């Protein structure tokens, strides 16, 4: 939860067999003023999440 710079065309690219394009949803390479940062986990074999 920070102050990024979103794009007019922001998009994600998967890591298993990624697409043709590059993942570029933001370009903010200057470690912006963050209010929050956390890391969580879940089940890798689950089908539904909430």
């Amino acid at each position: 939860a920070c102050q990024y710079t979103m794009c007019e065309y922001p998009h994600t690219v998967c890591k298993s067999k990624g697409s043709i394009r590059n993942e570029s949803w933001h370009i903010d390479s200057s470690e912006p003023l963050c209010l929050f940062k956390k890391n969580f986990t879940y089940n890798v074999s689950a089908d539904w999440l909430y």
């Binding site: 003023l33 963050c34 209010l35 929050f36 940062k37």
Partner: protein
């Protein structure tokens, strides 16, 4: 200064001095009160409670 998340101490000791048996003061996890602890073994809490 006054920007970010790297803060300072600003607070109390957080001492592991659970003094059961006597009437005490507490500010547990944000909730304040006075009580008497009486230690028991229980198994209903989950790891975010």
């Amino acid at each position: 200064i006054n920007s970010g998340t790297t803060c300072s101490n600003d607070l109390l000791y957080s001492n592991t001095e659970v003094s059961t048996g006597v009437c005490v003061n507490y500010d547990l996890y944000g909730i304040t009160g006075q009580g008497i602890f009486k230690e028991v073994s229980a198994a209903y809490y989950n790891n975010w409670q």
